[PDB]
Amino acid sequence: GKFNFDETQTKRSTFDNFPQALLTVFQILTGEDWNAVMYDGIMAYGGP
Amino acid sequence: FPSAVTIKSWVDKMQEDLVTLAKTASGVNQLVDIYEKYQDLYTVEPNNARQLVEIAARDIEKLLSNRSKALVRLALEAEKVQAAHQWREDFASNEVVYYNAKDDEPGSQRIKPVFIEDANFGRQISYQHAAVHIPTDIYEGSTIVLNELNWTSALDEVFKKNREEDPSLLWQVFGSATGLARYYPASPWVKIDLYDVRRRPWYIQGAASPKDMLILVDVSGSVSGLTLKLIRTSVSEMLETLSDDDFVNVASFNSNAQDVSCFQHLVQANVRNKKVLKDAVNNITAKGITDYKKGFSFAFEQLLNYNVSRANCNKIIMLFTDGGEERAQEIFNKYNKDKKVRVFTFSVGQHNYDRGPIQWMACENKGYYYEIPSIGAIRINTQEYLDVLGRPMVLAGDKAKQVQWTNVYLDALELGLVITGTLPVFNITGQFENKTNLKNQLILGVMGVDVSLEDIKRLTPRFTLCPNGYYFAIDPNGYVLLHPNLQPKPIGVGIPTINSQEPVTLDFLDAELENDIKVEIRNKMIDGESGEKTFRTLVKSQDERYIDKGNRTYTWTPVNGTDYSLALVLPTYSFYYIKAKLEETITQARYSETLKPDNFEESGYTFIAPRDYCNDLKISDNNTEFLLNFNEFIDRKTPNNPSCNADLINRVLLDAGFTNELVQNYWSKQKNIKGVKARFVVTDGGITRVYPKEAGENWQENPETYEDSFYKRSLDNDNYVFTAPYFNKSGPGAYESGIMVSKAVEIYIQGKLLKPAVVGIKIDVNSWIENFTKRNSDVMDCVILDDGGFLLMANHDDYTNQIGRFFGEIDPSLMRHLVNISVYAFNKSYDYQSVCEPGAASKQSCITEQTQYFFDNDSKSFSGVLDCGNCSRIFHGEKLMNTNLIFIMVESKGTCPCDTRLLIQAEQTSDGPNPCDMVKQPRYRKGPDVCFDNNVLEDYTDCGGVSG
Amino acid sequence: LELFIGKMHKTCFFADSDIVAEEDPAPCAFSGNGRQCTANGTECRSGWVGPNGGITNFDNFAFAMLTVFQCITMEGWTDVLYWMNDAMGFELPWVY
Amino acid sequence: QAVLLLFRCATGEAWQEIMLACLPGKLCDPESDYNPGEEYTCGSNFAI
Numbered sequence A: 001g002k003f004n005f006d007e008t009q010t011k012r013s014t015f016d017n018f019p020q021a022l023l024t025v026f027q028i029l030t031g032e033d034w035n036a037v038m039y040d041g042i043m044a045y046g047g048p
Numbered sequence B: 001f002p003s004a005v006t007i008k009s010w011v012d013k014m015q016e017d018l019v020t021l022a023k024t025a026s027g028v029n030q031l032v033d034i035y036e037k038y039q040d041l042y043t044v045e046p047n048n049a050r051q052l053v054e055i056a057a058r059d060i061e062k063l064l065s066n067r068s069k070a071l072v073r074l075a076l077e078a079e080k081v082q083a084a085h086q087w088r089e090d091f092a093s094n095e096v097v098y099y100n101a102k103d104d105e106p107g108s109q110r111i112k113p114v115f116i117e118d119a120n121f122g123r124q125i126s127y128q129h130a131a132v133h134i135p136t137d138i139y140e141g142s143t144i145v146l147n148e149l150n151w152t153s154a155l156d157e158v159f160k161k162n163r164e165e166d167p168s169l170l171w172q173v174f175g176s177a178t179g180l181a182r183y184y185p186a187s188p189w190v191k192i193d194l195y196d197v198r199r200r201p202w203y204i205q206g207a208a209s210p211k212d213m214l215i216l217v218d219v220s221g222s223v224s225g226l227t228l229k230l231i232r233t234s235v236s237e238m239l240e241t242l243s244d245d246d247f248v249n250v251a252s253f254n255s256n257a258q259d260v261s262c263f264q265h266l267v268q269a270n271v272r273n274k275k276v277l278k279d280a281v282n283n284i285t286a287k288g289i290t291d292y293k294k295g296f297s298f299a300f301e302q303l304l305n306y307n308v309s310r311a312n313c314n315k316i317i318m319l320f321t322d323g324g325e326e327r328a329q330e331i332f333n334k335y336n337k338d339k340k341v342r343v344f345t346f347s348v349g350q351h352n353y354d355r356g357p358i359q360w361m362a363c364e365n366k367g368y369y370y371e372i373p374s375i376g377a378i379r380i381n382t383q384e385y386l387d388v389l390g391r392p393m394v395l396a397g398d399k400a401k402q403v404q405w406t407n408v409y410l411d412a413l414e415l416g417l418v419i420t421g422t423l424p425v426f427n428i429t430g431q432f433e434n435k436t437n438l439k440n441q442l443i444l445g446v447m448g449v450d451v452s453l454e455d456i457k458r459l460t461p462r463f464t465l466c467p468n469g470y471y472f473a474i475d476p477n478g479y480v481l482l483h484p485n486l487q488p489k490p491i492g493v494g495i496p497t498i499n500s501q502e503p504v505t506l507d508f509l510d511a512e513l514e515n516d517i518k519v520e521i522r523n524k525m526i527d528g529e530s531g532e533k534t535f536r537t538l539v540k541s542q543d544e545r546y547i548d549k550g551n552r553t554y555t556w557t558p559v560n561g562t563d564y565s566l567a568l569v570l571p572t573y574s575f576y577y578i579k580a581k582l583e584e585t586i587t588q589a590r591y592s593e594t595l596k597p598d599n600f601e602e603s604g605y606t607f608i609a610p611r612d613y614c615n616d617l618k619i620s621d622n623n624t625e626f627l628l629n630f631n632e633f634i635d636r637k638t639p640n641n642p643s644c645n646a647d648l649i650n651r652v653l654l655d656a657g658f659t660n661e662l663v664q665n666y667w668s669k670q671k672n673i674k675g676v677k678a679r680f681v682v683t684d685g686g687i688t689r690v691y692p693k694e695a696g697e698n699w700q701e702n703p704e705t706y707e708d709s710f711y712k713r714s715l716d717n718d719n720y721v722f723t724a725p726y727f728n729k730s731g732p733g734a735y736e737s738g739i740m741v742s743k744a745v746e747i748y749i750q751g752k753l754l755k756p757a758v759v760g761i762k763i764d765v766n767s768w769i770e771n772f773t774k775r776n777s778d779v780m781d782c783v784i785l786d787d788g789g790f791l792l793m794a795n796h797d798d799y800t801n802q803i804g805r806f807f808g809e810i811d812p813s814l815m816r817h818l819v820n821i822s823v824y825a826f827n828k829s830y831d832y833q834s835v836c837e838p839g840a841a842s843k844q845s846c847i848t849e850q851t852q853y854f855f856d857n858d859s860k861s862f863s864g865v866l867d868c869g870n871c872s873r874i875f876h877g878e879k880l881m882n883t884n885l886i887f888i889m890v891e892s893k894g895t896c897p898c899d900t901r902l903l904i905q906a907e908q909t910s911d912g913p914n915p916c917d918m919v920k921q922p923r924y925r926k927g928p929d930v931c932f933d934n935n936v937l938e939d940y941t942d943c944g945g946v947s948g
Numbered sequence C: 001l002e003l004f005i006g007k008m009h010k011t012c013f014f015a016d017s018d019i020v021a022e023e024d025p026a027p028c029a030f031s032g033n034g035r036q037c038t039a040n041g042t043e044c045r046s047g048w049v050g051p052n053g054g055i056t057n058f059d060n061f062a063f064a065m066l067t068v069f070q071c072i073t074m075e076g077w078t079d080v081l082y083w084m085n086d087a088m089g090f091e092l093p094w095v096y
Numbered sequence D: 001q002a003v004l005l006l007f008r009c010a011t012g013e014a015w016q017e018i019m020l021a022c023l024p025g026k027l028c029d030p031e032s033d034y035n036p037g038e039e040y041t042c043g044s045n046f047a048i
């Protein structure tokens, strides 16, 4: 519940509930768009 | 410092040097003789306030009854035609033919009209058919629209029929519940288009009754992010569906329920209050847990207040959340067991929470459930709550078919300030046997007919009155339907800080100067009772610079058909008026020959008031071709006047001879005077004449007599009036114009006071200065001020260069002290219809605060010492007799090197008054007495979920 | 850190304002070599935060190291290559 | 540029997006000698 910072769009690869967290972890494991999730994780704690 | 006796004798030598020059050069006494030496070319007719009030209020009622008959004739036919519809679901072959507005097709054929330009219509129109408007977000050619697009085509015949009976008829529009608006006569629609007929103020007031809304906003933790931006926008668009008869308040709950603003209870939800609520809603944040039990208890308590004014009508709680698992059954059981309060619930945002409890809350309390997942659904889903509120209105039957009139608002089709009649249209299919009753509880639409304010100003003629007399009409809410100070501009709120859909609701106490006696007159006029009262009022001038006090008489009666109240403002010396009686030909030919532009060499440069002396003769608003048009009209036209009237033509022609006898027999004798630069006469007929034709190009006053600020100001005063020129090189006004002096002519025909005209001169500033000195002394200052603290001369040259300027902007220290010693009184006002440059966060509407100064005490001799600290300045003040001037002598400002902040008397951009403490003591108002809610036949069996 | 430091900081805003022109902003040329934002009325000047909100840049050792690690995993390295093509010229960044 | 695009696809960056972008219904730059009238012609079904 920390990806609600954009206020203009909804994020699909989040950690909201357990199935979504599992799907996000699997997606990062496959490597596809892992940097996109990392950017959201960084911006959720402030930013650069 | 000279003694008091020396100064007073010094004044009397110069005071009489101005009155005598103005009394002889202008010729105020001679015009008295001219107006008294005939007493046969006119007649003094009584001006009864009680009769005019009751006559003009009967013509206004008849005008609104013509439109009421037009609405009934349209609403009945629409119900009959629609009841005979078959709901065909294919239009490929039987294509519907219609004219679509804002255009250069499955089952539609477009129409190319002729669009002949017409008067009394600022656009091109066509009476052959009726135009159809379909909003951008609604697809034309759909099954619902196309079916709606047949049975409305039978309305075109009735549209034509209503216009034939009354040619002076404005837009007649049908706002369908589907979204399309069909109006007559057809005219092309006026960036992108966002117009929706179902959000207009005239549609909203007729689709339901006044409501006591209360918006509950979920500001818990889970609503943070995108789904809060959707909630804040949804509340803002929801507040736009409320009018002055609706009472609303906004509260938010997150483990604790509190108001989002300073109101703490229901407010009238006008433009001022809605702005405060909108600003506070846009400043909420999401944090905490959700508590529906505490949130709904807070909302149910605010609807049971009854301490303050409410609508005493539809009570609805409108919940803005996302989703939860709490149903709060005990709260609904405890508070509304008998279902007196409706609950509408909204599920906003892209989420996956439980909508079960939200849906259950909706229809357990006779409400409806809505989905707002994105921005595109905000516009449509926040206006559909009126369908539920309209259920008791349709079940009432023919007792709910009452014509209502909206507030004054600017027309969508660029027509000006208009009001709209309103009448709903019902679904009565199958009612002959009463078997369907399922979709028959929703209105088909709303009937509308527009009445312009120009049509109402025509039924109240003001040209038999003095320029200080006028009519004004009031709303039960207190707003003015008619007023001279009402302007075709939207009313603003606050300062526009940037990095016309609202109605023009101007209150009576805000249109003019507020007084403790106006309030009781306003209350007596709101509740509809006739009366009259004569009392002393202090009146703001036409230009917001001077305040003058004079007697006024207010006479009011209620308009019987409607809920409006009409009042006539009429001062003293205006109970009689000059009516010209003269029909001979050769006595009018000589008068008309005076208005020839080629005769201005000896008769002075002559103006003419752009009045509708005679239909044909149109107005040009330039007074260059209009005079040529007018004088070439009178000779090339039979004197019998088959169409227009001669009362407005005899009066102007009679005063043409009266002013001719003055410019010829007295002004020509004294061709040039050392101290006189121009000579002007302004009459009630509507002509102004300046003898020096070379000085006729310096005339900046309005050609219409009734709009001249100095003319109205001169009538109230019994002495000469000095008008200071404008500042900041606003045209030629510094040295080549002069200082305007005016004096009203007073005649006594049979002992009855009349003021038909004013006369005066333009004193040249250059020649008056020498008389003032008989110079630039470094010890003492000699300045002259008028009634209002505007500089007219000084004794330091540099001060003279800045002429016609407020004395507080050139010497703040002395001006501020003058107010404290009670020589200059002042009241501030608020100008809600004003435009100003935006500030840091073109031009936009804003509220500007206006202040004017006037002589408070009647004493004439003033003396005192101005102490500015570690120094001392002594002054003496003497007011000139028979004049609104004051002379004050003070030492130079360089003797005491102190300079406080300059005192500004100008259009100051403000945001007051503060509305947080206005709602504590709101103005008296009366609401509609008809309420339609809580009908036992209401179905309400579709909550929000049986369809999803 | 040596080849290019602080070069992704120039996108094209509107004329005499602080609003970016395009929806997906990209850097201009650092000094008249790479991308030139040519619209009706536009100019580009320093003041931009960065392509990915400031996360993707070589203007710090930590930022450069993170971007290098991201590029090695073959995930979103062409984006950085294109941003250098826009900011710097066109023949140097392809070698790196 | 073609070799760089092929290397990008070899590393597997957005190769399916490029394949979609190389479909028949695509406009052609105003520099090729193409018959007047039909601009949206270049692009072939052989991209897949």
Ligand SMILES: *[C@@H]1O[C@H](CO)[C@@H](O[C@@H]2O[C@H](CO)[C@@H](O[C@@H]3O[C@H](CO)[C@@H](O[C@@H]4O[C@H](CO)[C@@H](O)[C@H](O)[C@H]4NC(C)=O)[C@H](O)[C@H]3NC(C)=O)[C@H](O)[C@H]2NC(C)=O)[C@H](O)[C@H]1NC(C)=O
Residues within 6 Å of the ligand: B086, B087, B089, B143, B148, B427, B428, B429, B430, B436, B437, B438, B439, B440, B444
């Ligand atoms: C005034 O009230 C009358 C009745 O009180 C109302 O006339 C009724 O109109 C509805 C249409 O809204 C007719 O409904 C018929 O039955 C269904 C209901 O939609 C339609 O079949 C499909 O229904 C689905 C919804 O589930 C819909 O999406 C689809 O488009 C429909 N059509 C298909 C699949 O082809 C029928 O098409 C529809 N029409 C028929 C059968 O002709 C009622 O039958 C009408 N009732 C009467 C007594 O005429 C009228 O519209 C109201 N006035 C206005 C302005 O709306």
Ligand SMILES: *[C@@H]1O[C@H](CO)[C@@H](O[C@@H]2O[C@H](CO)[C@@H](O[C@@H]3O[C@H](CO)[C@@H](O)[C@H](O)[C@H]3NC(C)=O)[C@H](O)[C@H]2NC(C)=O)[C@H](O)[C@H]1NC(C)=O
Residues within 6 Å of the ligand: B081, B084, B085, B094, B095, B096, B150, B151, B153, B154
């Ligand atoms: C909805 O649109 C329909 C298609 O335009 C209208 O249906 C047609 O209206 C015509 C005009 O009245 C009819 O033409 C004549 O109708 C009279 C009356 O019954 C008869 O003389 C004939 O039926 C016909 N005359 C001819 C063909 O010479 C059509 O009959 C009628 N039906 C069709 C074309 O199938 C509806 O009237 C319209 N609904 C409303 C409420 O206006």
Ligand SMILES: *[C@@H]1O[C@H](CO)[C@@H](O[C@@H]2O[C@H](CO)[C@@H](O)[C@H](O)[C@H]2NC(C)=O)[C@H](O)[C@H]1NC(C)=O
Residues within 6 Å of the ligand: B054, B057, B058, B557, B558, B559, B560
């Ligand atoms: C509005 O209607 C009322 C009555 O419905 C009118 O009251 C009249 O008042 C006069 C006194 O001024 C009485 O002589 C009449 O008898 C009253 N009328 C009736 C029907 O009794 C009132 O004048 C009407 N107002 C207007 C402006 O027409």
Ligand SMILES: *[C@@H]1O[C@H](CO)[C@@H](O[C@@H]2O[C@H](CO)[C@@H](O)[C@H](O)[C@H]2NC(C)=O)[C@H](O)[C@H]1NC(C)=O
Residues within 6 Å of the ligand: B307
């Ligand atoms: C006004 O509202 C208050 C509270 O909502 C009502 O309650 C009374 O308020 C007055 C003054 O505060 C006091 O009599 C008591 O504190 C309250 N209770 C009772 C039983 O009076 C009040 O009734 C409302 N109306 C008025 C006229 O005050």
Ligand SMILES: *[C@@H]1O[C@H](CO)[C@@H](O[C@@H]2O[C@H](CO)[C@@H](O)[C@H](O)[C@H]2NC(C)=O)[C@H](O)[C@H]1NC(C)=O
Residues within 6 Å of the ligand: B514, B515, B516, B825, B826, B827
């Ligand atoms: C407009 O006129 C003056 C402007 O200062 C004010 O009227 C006086 O207000 C003071 C304030 O208490 C009173 O003591 C005086 O008795 C008032 N003078 C009167 C009533 O003649 C006030 O601001 C305005 N007057 C109104 C609103 O009636």
Ligand SMILES: *[C@@H]1O[C@H](CO)[C@@H](O)[C@H](O)[C@H]1NC(C)=O
Residues within 6 Å of the ligand: B059, B062, B063, B066, B165, B166
């Ligand atoms: C309309 O109003 C006028 C005056 O307001 C009145 O004479 C007339 O009878 C009314 N009705 C019609 C149909 O003109």
Ligand SMILES: [Ca+2]
Residues within 6 Å of the ligand: B220, B221, B222, B223, B289, B290, B323, B324
């Ligand atoms: Ca919650």
Ligand SMILES: [Ca+2]
Residues within 6 Å of the ligand: A031, A032, A033, C074, C075, C076, D012, D013, D014
């Ligand atoms: Ca990849």
